[PDB]
């Protein structure tokens, strides 16, 4: 029972023999995590498998052939490409109108792998009109395992932002997301929220689409979902939104977003820590009302704490937050920052190797100093006492001339007798 024999029997004009052979090809393609795909592609089985999709008289054969093709397409780009170059894609689309659920589902799956290969493949499967048939499967009578596959392909359809998915696709997918965000199934919920991630990632125009749909009041509460996989994705999704305009950012804050952040800032997982302060850094880049909202939510001391004792990633995000507040805020808003003891943990970051962080801290100190007027000396003294001035003083080296210049001007304007 060889591979060369399998491709032969697969050519048979008899269907029993053919089905059996195609089943054999499927079995070779689902025996481990590293199937003999390249060998299968070289055997010439691909055109045979593709033609089997035509056989409306035999759903078993359509399903088995689709399954074999699906696994070939789960591989590398070159292996997925071999499937699409055999002209399989239009037949999968055809099979989405199949009256048989098994065939529909395997067509959906195979198309998901092809869509996931890249934006060009995404755009091609879209332009043939995959989205509307796909989303039509969504019903309450659909088997959860089927629905999980649909929502996964939905993600792939939303992924890649250069070029981003077309208007028509997004406008189709959003109302299906409004439905699925209410599902209790965790896998589905996770995908629904990750699809929103990517949508909100394509930029401010797409963010307005997500906002305009009415989905955000249902998305913000998933920052506190009991399932960490849901939270992680909701953090990314809502986080993307608040990189939008101030008005867009406000839509989120008005859903009481900041109430959810104590439990993320103190979360065991540092990755959640990091993304939480990232988020908050984008808020302190907002207007003064929005800086005020972070302060009022009692979030600044947890920020300064993570700024002090957090892993480098969270510290990097924390410094931006501080720096962004330092230029967004009012005089008193910055005063609060200082009386919350920001000056020492902020200054200690001047030693790190990441040059961007160092310019971000230096930019912070500079805004603080130019802003507190009578208190220049008073704050100069704070900077000096924690050893910040010492750190600033030796950033006056030439390995980074941007850092250098900024170190020089702070020292010239604020620490020269």
């Amino acid at each position: 029972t060889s591979l060369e024999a399998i491709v032969q029997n697969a050519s048979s004009d008899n269907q029993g023999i053919q089905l059996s052979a195609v089943q054999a090809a499927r079995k070779l393609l689902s025996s481990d995590r590293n199937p003999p795909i390249d060998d299968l592609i070289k055997s010439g089985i691909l055109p045979i498998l593709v033609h089997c999709l035509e056989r409306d008289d035999n759903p078993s054969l359509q399903f088995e052939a689709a399954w074999a093709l699906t696994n070939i397409a789960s591989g590398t780009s070159e292996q997925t490409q071999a499937v699409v170059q055999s002209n399989a894609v239009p037949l999968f689309l055809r099979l989405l109108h199949s009256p048989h659920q098994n065939v529909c589902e395997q067509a959906v799956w195979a198309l998901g792998n092809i869509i996931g290969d890249g934006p060009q493949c995404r755009d091609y499967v879209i332009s043939l009109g995959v989205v509307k048939p796909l989303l039509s499967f969504i019903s309450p009578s659909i088997p959860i395992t089927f629905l999980r596959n649909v929502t996964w392909v939905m993600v792939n359809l939303c992924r890649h932002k250069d070029p981003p998915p077309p208007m028509e696709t997004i406008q189709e997918i959003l109302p299906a997301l409004c439905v699925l965000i209410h599902h209790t199934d965790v896998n589905i919920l996770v995908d629904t929220v990750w699809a929103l991630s990517y949508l909100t990632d394509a930029g401010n125009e797409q963010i307005q689409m997500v906002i305009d749909s009415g989905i955000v009041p249902h998305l913000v509460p998933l920052l506190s979902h009991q399932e960490v996989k849901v939270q992680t994705a909701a953090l990314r999704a809502v986080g993307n939104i608040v990189t939008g305009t101030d008005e867009q950012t406000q839509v989120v804050l008005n859903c009481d977003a900041l109430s959810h952040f104590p439990a993320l800032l103190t979360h065991p997982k540092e990755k959640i820590n990091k993304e939480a302060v990232w988020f908050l850094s984008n808020i302190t880049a907002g207007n003064q009302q929005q800086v005020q909202a972070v302060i009022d939510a009692n979030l600044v001391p947890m920020i300064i704490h993570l700024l002090d004792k957090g892993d480098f990633g969270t510290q990097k995000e924390a410094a931006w937050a501080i720096s962004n507040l330092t230029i967004s805020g009012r005089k008193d808003q910055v005063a609060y920052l200082i009386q919350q003891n920001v000056i020492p943990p902020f200054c200690n970051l001047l030693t790190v190797k990441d040059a961007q962080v160092v310019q971000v801290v230096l930019d912070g100190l500079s805004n603080i100093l130019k802003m507190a007027e009578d208190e220049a000396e008073t704050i100069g003294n704070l900077i000096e006492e924690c050893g910040g001035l010492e750190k600033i003083e030796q950033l006056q080296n030439h390995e980074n001339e941007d850092i250098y210049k900024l170190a020089y001007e702070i020292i010239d304007q604020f620490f020269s007798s």
Binding site: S30, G75, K271
Partner: protein
């Protein structure tokens, strides 16, 4: 007005033409999150800036699944 726009941006340093020809302060508000640009902030004044509303770190372990193989029926 113009310096209010710039309060959304971090001045990084000297012009870096890798990031294209200098922009206007008004064209600055067309950038993507975390995007760097060179901008003209005065007569003969071109600096590199970064947008203060920033991009996210690349996910790896966090939920992806771009392609999925079917191992069995159930």
């Amino acid at each position: 007005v113009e310096s209010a726009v710039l309060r959304g941006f971090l001045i990084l340093g000297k012009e870096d033409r890798r990031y294209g020809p200098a922009l206007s302060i008004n064209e600055l508000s067309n950038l993507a999150k975390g995007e760097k640009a060179n901008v003209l902030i005065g007569q003969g004044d071109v600096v590199l800036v970064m947008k203060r509303k920033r991009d996210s770190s690349i996910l790896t372990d966090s939920q992806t699944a771009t392609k999925r193989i079917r191992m069995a029926i159930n």
